[PDB]
């Protein structure tokens, strides 16, 4: 199965991001995994 989509909810284990991406929690809603490095 493909890795965890970027900018996607944290649901399912809460913090199961693929690479070294960090899950950023919004104001009230859940969090979304955000990959460290962008382009390069």
Swiss-Prot record:
Expressed by the venom gland. Coiled coil: none annotated. Changing residue 26 to A: Loss of ability to inhibit rASIC1a at low concentration and gain of function as a positive modulator at high concentrations (>100 nM), probably by stabilizing the open state of the channel. It comes from the Eukaryota. Disulfide bonds join 3-18, 10-23, 17-33. Keywords: Disulfide bond, Ion channel impairing toxin, Knottin, Pharmaceutical, Proton-gated sodium channel impairing toxin, Secreted, Toxin. The record marks 7, 24, 26-28, 30 as: Key residue for interaction with ASIC1a. Changing residue 34 to A: 1.4-fold decrease in ability to inhibit rASIC1a channel. One of its GO terms (molecular function) is ion channel regulator activity. This peptide is present at only 0.4% abundance in P.cambridgei venom. Negative results: does not act on rat and mouse ASIC1a-ASIC2a. Does not act on rat ASIC1a-ASIC3. This is Psalmotoxin-1. It comes from Psalmopoeus cambridgei (Trinidad chevron tarantula).
